[PDB]
From a paper:
Wzc, an integral cytoplasmic membrane tyrosine autokinase protein serves as the master regulator of the biosynthesis and export of many bacterial capsular polysaccharides and exopolysaccharides. Wzc comprises a large periplasmic domain, two transmembrane helices and a C-terminal cytoplasmic kinase domain with a tyrosine-rich tail. Wzc regulates polymerisation functions through cycling the formation and dissociation of an octameric complex, driven by changes in the phosphorylation status of the tyrosine-rich tail. E. coli Wzc serves a model for a wider family of polysaccharide co-polymerases.
We show that it is binding of the i-2 tyrosine to the tyrosine pocket (where i is the number of the residue positioned at the kinase active site) orders the tail between the tyrosine at the active site and helix α23. A mutant of 2pY (Wzc3YE_N711Y) stabilises the C-terminal tail was functional in vivo, restoring immunoreactive CPS to levels approximating the wild type. This is consistent with a model in which the more stable the Wzc octamer the higher the Wzy activity. We note the reduction of CPS production by destabilising D28A and K701A mutants further support this model. The Wzc3YE_N711Y shows greater phosphorylation relative to Wzc3YE and proteomic analysis of purified WzcYF_713Y/N711Y reveals both N711Y and Y713 are phosphorylated.
Numbering used by the authors:
A (entry chain F): 17 to 64, 85 to 297, 304 to 477, 494 to 714
B (entry chain G): 17 to 64, 85 to 279, 385 to 477, 494 to 714
Amino acid sequence: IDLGRVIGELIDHRKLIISITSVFTLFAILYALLATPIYETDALIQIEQSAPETALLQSRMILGKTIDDLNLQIQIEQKYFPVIGRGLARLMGEKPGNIDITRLYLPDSDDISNNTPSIILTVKDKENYSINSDGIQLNGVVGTLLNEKGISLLVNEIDAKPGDQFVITQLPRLKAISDLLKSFSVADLGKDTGMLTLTLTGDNPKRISHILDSISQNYLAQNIARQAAQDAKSLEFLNQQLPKVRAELDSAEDKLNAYRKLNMEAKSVLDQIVNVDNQLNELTFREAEVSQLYTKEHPTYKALMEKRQTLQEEKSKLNKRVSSMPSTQQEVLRLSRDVESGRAVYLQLLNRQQELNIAKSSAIGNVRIIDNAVTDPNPVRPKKTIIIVIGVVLGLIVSVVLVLFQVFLRRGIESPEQLEEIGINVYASIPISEWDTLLAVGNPADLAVEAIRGLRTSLHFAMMEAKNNVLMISGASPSAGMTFISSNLAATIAITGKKVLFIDADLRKGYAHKMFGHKNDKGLSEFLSGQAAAEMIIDKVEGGGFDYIGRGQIPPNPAELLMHPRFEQLLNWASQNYDLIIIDTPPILAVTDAAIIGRYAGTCLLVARFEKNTVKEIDVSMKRFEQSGVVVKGCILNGVVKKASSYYRYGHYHYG
Amino acid sequence: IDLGRVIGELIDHRKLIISITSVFTLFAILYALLATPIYETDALIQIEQSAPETALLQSRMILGKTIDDLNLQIQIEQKYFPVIGRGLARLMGEKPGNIDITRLYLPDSDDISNNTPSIILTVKDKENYSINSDGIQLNGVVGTLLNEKGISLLVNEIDAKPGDQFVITQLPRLKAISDLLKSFSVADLGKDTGMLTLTLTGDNPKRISHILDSISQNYLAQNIARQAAQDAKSLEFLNQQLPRAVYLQLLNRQQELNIAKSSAIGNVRIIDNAVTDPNPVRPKKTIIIVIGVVLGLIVSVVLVLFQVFLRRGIESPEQLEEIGINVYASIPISEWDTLLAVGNPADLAVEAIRGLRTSLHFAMMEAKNNVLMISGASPSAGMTFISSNLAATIAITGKKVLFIDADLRKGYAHKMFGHKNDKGLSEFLSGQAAAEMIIDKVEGGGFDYIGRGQIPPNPAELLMHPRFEQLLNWASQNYDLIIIDTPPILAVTDAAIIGRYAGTCLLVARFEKNTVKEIDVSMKRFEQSGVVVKGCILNGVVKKASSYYRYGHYHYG
Ligand SMILES: Nc1ncnc2c1ncn2[C@@H]1O[C@H](COP(=O)(O)OP(=O)(O)O)[C@@H](O)[C@H]1O
Ligand SMILES: Nc1ncnc2c1ncn2[C@@H]1O[C@H](COP(=O)(O)OP(=O)(O)O)[C@@H](O)[C@H]1O
Ligand SMILES: [Mg+2]
Ligand SMILES: [Mg+2]
């Protein structure tokens, strides 16, 4: 191949190329403009090693401590119904809403799969709101806590417009730890120094900085505990307190065994209290530790008793509910409470004993925060430019390969050279006429009619020394242009003052009578079957100037009629009253009518359609005519259009 | 391919090559002369390690301290409307202005995007100025501080000419830290030495040196505070432990801790305070210009090679003669509504046409009659030009010539000869005229002609009338030569109808427009209609250095 071919093919398929590339680039643009941006924050820590510190920072202990501090197990998502509502809302300048939640406890359905309970909160105003878990509508108010139907909720400072909806999920603690750990990274950045670089990525530019600050504070507090833990009495306090609790736990277990040897509400309110007790105990430890390493007027410490206030209020409401259930199940719950309270505290103290050991045996005495966490205002993802470039390049690659397949899979004719290589004379090339009437009469100045005049002058020289004045037009496949060519050629030969007869011998799908204006009675069939004479079948074209014979009524045995000798009698009679006779026939590959007629025709031409037919089809038609004893003079290419890749140039342009 | 061909192609396209390369080089010059210069300053620090000190130097605490000290959060820009105003103003040697601002507070609009409040200050004199936020015009004066509409401002020492405008931005502290960081670099250069090279690049040759000095001072004063502290912690502990030999022992230890606190010089030492290299490091003008010139050359050469491989027109008669087509002449462009063979009888094109005339005088013997038909493949190839001038030159030799304009669709011969447009060829063929009212005399010629007449609606069908052959037979007895001009053969079929009665037929191929394919198709289409084409005439030739086919198209006399 050569570059001229490929350039021509590209120019010809430019519309497809442009469409595909535009679609791919549009998809890339929309993706890069709708993807939620991802911000990144960092901090710098000074270590007085650093590999065990790297391992310890990403441990479940410290991250879990941070989550318990910041209530990261409460997931809040602004609701947009489509997969693109969020992006457009950001683009429209709409301010994303947020709600501050300080207490959430769902009834914890805890089925086989959905371990994460979730509810939907709809904003009604700046004060009240609606809540639905499974369609059950409840109304709540900012400020006052809600304790209904095994659902505990505390909403503060709703910042949104009315009508907004938010999904509230209570995801499990380990899930929150895993989510935090996925997006959190630690590095040394020097491979030897006491410098640690902490990095965190997330979609909220403020939340991630707060989280990273909390992580740094927790780690520093853990190491600063080391220096003060050796002389601390908490070690001896825990060493003595733990055996006492275990006996209480064991005694609680033993009592529970004696009473044993399932009310839904009673079980739920039991879970209500146990959750409250857990938060109260851990907060009590947290308040102690914060009071030691921080001050009371610190906002963190101010947060502590406020949450402690809420927990006591929730417990008070729970006990009032417990006061309302019958004592029969109350005894079971009180036994159930103590066992779980014992287990929870025993678990809590075991960590406390473990954590206190963690402080003491720490080789790195001094840990310093050089740079507190800040967030880079430029999002790190998505990287818009690379996405757009990849989209454009992908569009170009797929367009080019698609064009190469379409080029390599075409087999139709493209230029008369393909036919002339085989040894077939092409007598004309007719272009597509963009214009049920004769073209050679409606628009005599059309390009196609000019090409047909060229064909007329070719024939006037070819059809000399022919055995008679009968010309047959046929073709390989239907809808190639046989009737079009034949009728228009008849018109153009008629306008020069010669008597022309057009015979529509397509006894299967002929419609020439429609295109000429007709008296459909007494066509060719009626003559061939013997029930008409030769004079009632000939009609005059109105806008033409030549006579015609229509097919007539469709017979059931077309090919058998054409073999009757009356057909040759008709041709011999007509050949003395007309200067030219043009016969239209069905395709030769489909049926055999053309080969029957061709015995009586002095000249025979095939019509090959430009892009549809193949060289093989035309060769096969040539040979099939040969076998039946019909000599084909040549071919006529029809329906040509301008192709830049052709590099073969017709005169199909207006001159006048 | 060979070297001669490519050299010729470059010689021929030299105009395009020079134009493209010069444009690229001009843009390179403009960029290298208008880009804002960037200066670079450096300093050298000695470390008494060196891996964590790099990270501590680029920390937000030290850079933030520097920014707070030198107020890097007040950004001042001289205003030039275009992306080239600053560069041009520098080129005329105009001194940029500067303003000292020591206190600034904007209302902090802080919308979703524009977190950076800004104002525009227009200097009116050495003392007063106008301030606009969003059209809110205020007047301020150097010295007195301003607090109006939630804007606090203090300007000192305006150094500019009146009428200048300055954009004043109060960017957030973190943005200033990031901006400082991106232009600040630290390297070790020894991988073990206590040597650190600090580098800072910026547009102001003095401001960057001040900033780097401030950074070094902050880092150094921070470092000694670390060593002094651990001594100070030890000194504080000993003082707090004071309750007589032990009493003197602690006092002596206290003095040792006092002297160790004051003798601060420690791990960090400033070898070289920052200085600025006066030659800007960017833009690197020479490499920019070299890249521009090379890019121009490469794109020009690729464009020329592209055009060469996509060229398809005829270039020399050898291309036609390979196929087996006799080329009887080659006519060049005549750079000179009149017959060329009369206006400028000594033109080069008329010389080539005389060569064609002598070729014909030998080709047209043994022709069945004395009729010559000139046709072509595509329109505006030169058929009318060639036919008319050939008639003129053959007429000046004393032979009777008849010129027929059988282009019944767009023939304009009557215009070019001076006309009585009535009774053309159409009127004769349709039967509404006789053979004698149609023949007209050319004034500056010497031959008769027949114009087309009125454009008919059925040109090709008229030409089939036997009256046309009657006219030719009659005229062939009263003239020595008959020339017939015809429409192209690819467009319409008129030429192939006419060619039945012509003894000789020639094609005209236009030099670069037509290709060999059209000429071959035209020959074959003439053959199918029973018309034998004698040969071809190449028209419109111009000099190509790449040709290596070389004509007699030069003056001799
Ligand atoms: N060059 C052409 N320009 C415009 N229409 C054409 C051309 N060739 C064929 N056609 C139209 O396409 C249709 C199929 O051609 P037709 O000859 O009637 O069928 P068939 O070849 O099977 O006998 C017809 O409507 C015809 O008018
Ligand atoms: N070698 C030439 N030098 C100068 N002008 C030419 C030359 N060949 C053709 N032309 C001019 O360019 C125009 C196109 O030629 P023309 O013969 O009129 O078209 P056509 O061949 O279709 O009849 C004409 O105006 C002609 O005078
Ligand atoms: Mg048909
Ligand atoms: Mg002309």
